[PDB]
Amino acid sequence: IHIGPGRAFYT
Amino acid sequence: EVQLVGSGGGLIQPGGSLRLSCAASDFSVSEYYMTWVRQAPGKGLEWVAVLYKDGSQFYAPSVKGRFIVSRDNSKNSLYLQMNNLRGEDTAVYFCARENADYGSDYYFGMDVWGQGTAVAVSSASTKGPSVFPLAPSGTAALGCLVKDYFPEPVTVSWNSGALTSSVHTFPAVLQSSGLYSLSSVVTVPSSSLGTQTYICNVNHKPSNTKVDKKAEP
Amino acid sequence: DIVMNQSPPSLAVTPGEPASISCRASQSLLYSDGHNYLDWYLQKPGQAPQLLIYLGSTRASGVPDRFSGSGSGTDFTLKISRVEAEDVGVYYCMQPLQSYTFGQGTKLEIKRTVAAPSVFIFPPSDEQLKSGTASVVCLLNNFYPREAKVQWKVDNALQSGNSQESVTEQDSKDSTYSLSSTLTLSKADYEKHKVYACEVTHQGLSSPVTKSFNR
């Protein structure tokens, strides 16, 4: 669900 | 009290590796997103690494594949394994608790930060400081001279933290010798001169030196 | 690759006056969740950053009323309604949306009346002379503004490239500065003379000031 660092990369 | 206290760090030769520690209080490091933010000398704030409760890890491009964020559920600690260190890495490292779970909607900023531990990448060996007294004679001033050390930082206090107000510890100055040097001063009443013990406690972490000097008239 | 641009780098404010720092993002820190993801942090000199405002506009637990964050989309503004002497430090803005990036920072300075330095001069310690070096140290304590001339004169004859200074950060109680200048000599040269003097010019002094001693 965490594709990267930051809020913008949460599915 | 809720806090982060970090440790480790110090002087470390280029290429070498080094582990920064950081331990929580009154909350679980396994139950929050955690971040490592550094700050190069004089320069500003740079994010370095994040470890999500939701298992995962991601790194700033500048370091990725050299640093590692681990936690320890039993030791309640956050760790930053730093491998193959370039001079570009020497800075002050802050671990911080990002009080947020993107799972739910909520977010509450970098809630808690650590005091910040210093890392110095360098070829050169350590050197601990000479401490010398700055001696006085309404009100008067006395102090300590902390000469010829490396690397920064060095921590100065008076009467083991007791004496704070009227105290001024100056920024270190770079000497022609490659070695840092600073002075720390206090202004006190000329009357308590003849009757009050003024000792300054100099502590230079990476050289394992630790000095308490009695400044007197 | 979100980039933040802070304005201005520095600004001086009198306590009571309002201040206002600006942050400008490369993209919109507005997320589809109906929120603005931008923070404001204070880094008081030699401390860890402390949170002021999260979610663009929400002040954290403990932060004083006087701090308020506004803005939306890509333009943002931290505002202190009434500055205090202790609001001095560096203010950074951070976005936690695409990676984690910070503004260049903004140095807030306090304005206050002229304050003249009280001056102290320190002859080298016997302890240090027994090591072949001699440091003559000069203190300028609690003055404003920050600029000050410190001129060393040995046997009334001034030096050059011989001393070096260091200045404290602005104090958070009385918004003052303090200053250390250090005349470094060989033990050799130090014995060759008898009167050492420290001559400071500063805005709060009508005429210059000297403190000196004898071997």
Side-chain angles (χ1 to χ4, degrees):
Chain A
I1 33 185
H2 279 263
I3 141 173
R7 163 64 174 184
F9 299 159
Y10 186 72
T11 319
Chain B
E1 187 193 353
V2 154
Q3 58 186 328
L4 301 177
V5 162
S7 60
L11 170 56
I12 178 49
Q13 89 267 7
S17 298
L18 183 66
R19 149 156 292 108
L20 305 175
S21 297
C22 205
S25 282
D26 297 356
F27 73 96
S28 290
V29 57
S30 67
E31 291 252 300
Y32 295 76
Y33 296 173
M34 304 288 284
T35 42
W36 281 101
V37 190
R38 70 188 172 170
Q39 181 178 32
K43 313 189 176 306
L45 267 39
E46 169 190 25
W47 171 83
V48 178
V50 64
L51 174 65
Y52 294 105
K53 76 222 304 183
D54 316 316
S56 34
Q57 329 154 3
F58 308 94
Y59 305 80
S62 35
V63 301
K64 192 178 211 78
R66 286 181 311 123
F67 293 179
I68 285 157
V69 226
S70 350
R71 61 173 150 257
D72 193 315
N73 282 83
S74 102
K75 307 184 195 327
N76 208 28
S77 272
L78 170 71
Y79 292 93
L80 187 78
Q81 174 57 29
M82 305 186 325
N83 290 306
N84 189 77
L85 292 165
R86 340 194 163 280
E88 299 86 77
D89 291 322
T90 101
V92 175
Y93 288 77
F94 304 96
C95 52
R97 185 188 69 164
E98 172 178 12
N99 190 340
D101 172 64
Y102 315 153
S104 171
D105 197 35
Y106 72 75
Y107 175 94
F108 299 93
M110 308 298 213
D111 219 321
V112 177
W113 297 65
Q115 5 79 209
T117 25
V119 179
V121 191
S122 177
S123 57
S125 47
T126 336
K127 176 163 192 322
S130 287
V131 192
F132 303 121
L134 295 156
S137 303
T139 61
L142 45 72
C144 275
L145 189 57
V146 185
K147 218 200 162 55
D148 302 322
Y149 64 93
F150 174 87
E152 287 258 73
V154 77
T155 45
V156 183
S157 51
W158 292 77
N159 300 347
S160 322
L163 175 38
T164 83
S165 259
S166 67
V167 109
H168 284 301
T169 319
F170 297 93
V173 202
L174 205 22
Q175 311 193 111
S176 41
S177 69
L179 296 174
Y180 294 103
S181 183
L182 70 69
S183 44
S184 195
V185 281
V186 218
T187 22
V188 293
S190 290
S191 54
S192 64
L193 227 42
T195 157
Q196 260 274 347
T197 281
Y198 294 121
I199 63 202
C200 90
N201 332 116
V202 194
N203 174 24
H204 187 218
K205 297 285 183 56
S207 77
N208 294 320
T209 58
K210 204 178 173 304
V211 166
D212 305 81
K213 169 71 64 283
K214 202 195 292 294
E216 274 170 341
Chain C
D1 243 46
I2 299 199
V3 158
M4 318 279 278
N5 269 26
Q6 242 175 287
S7 292
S10 147
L11 85 165
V13 181
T14 313
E17 280 178 1
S20 171
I21 316 178
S22 300
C23 201
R24 197 206 330 125
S26 138
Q27 311 168 17
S28 177
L29 282 19
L30 215 178
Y31 194 51
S32 50
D33 83 318
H35 272 320
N36 280 311
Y37 281 106
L38 160 135
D39 295 353
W40 287 104
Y41 299 99
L42 207 211
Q43 204 193 12
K44 312 202 47 53
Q47 294 183 15
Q50 88 209 56
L51 172 72
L52 290 166
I53 283 151
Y54 60 99
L55 287 179
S57 313
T58 317
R59 100 172 62 86
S61 299
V63 185
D65 48 302
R66 306 141 30 208
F67 289 87
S68 45
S70 78
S72 181
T74 75
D75 277 38
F76 287 86
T77 283
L78 170 65
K79 260 194 71 280
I80 315 165
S81 47
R82 289 148 305 242
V83 178
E84 321 278 30
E86 46 274 13
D87 297 338
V88 60
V90 174
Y91 296 77
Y92 298 92
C93 61
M94 181 223 57
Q95 137 275 166
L97 209 108
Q98 289 188 26
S99 174
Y100 298 94
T101 40
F102 298 91
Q104 309 101 302
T106 294
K107 178 62 161 312
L108 197 250
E109 341 224 67
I110 309 302
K111 282 173 164 176
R112 50 115 58 221
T113 77
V114 232
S118 53
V119 169
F120 295 88
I121 181 155
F122 292 90
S125 53
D126 13 69
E127 196 164 351
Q128 176 188 28
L129 275 334
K130 299 178 87 169
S131 75
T133 179
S135 294
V136 198
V137 175
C138 192
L139 183 54
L140 276 60
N141 196 37
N142 297 325
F143 61 87
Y144 188 94
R146 171 192 170 91
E147 29 277 351
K149 198 191 193 191
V150 172
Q151 222 142 246
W152 284 98
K153 285 196 284 206
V154 184
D155 280 350
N156 224 276
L158 59 153
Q159 318 300 141
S160 196
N162 190 199
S163 79
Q164 48 176 1
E165 305 176 2
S166 170
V167 187
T168 73
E169 231 48 56
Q170 199 173 2
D171 181 24
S172 278
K173 282 186 271 183
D174 64 14
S175 297
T176 207
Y177 296 88
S178 303
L179 189 157
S180 146
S181 182
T182 306
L183 186 86
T184 295
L185 276 24
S186 60
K187 186 195 173 194
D189 294 316
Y190 178 72
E191 325 273 15
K192 301 183 174 171
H193 306 79
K194 187 151 74 171
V195 270
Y196 291 92
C198 173
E199 185 175 272
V200 19
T201 316
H202 183 254
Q203 187 75 276
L205 275 4
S206 62
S207 51
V209 169
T210 299
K211 289 306 204 295
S212 47
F213 66 83
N214 296 306
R215 304 201 316 103

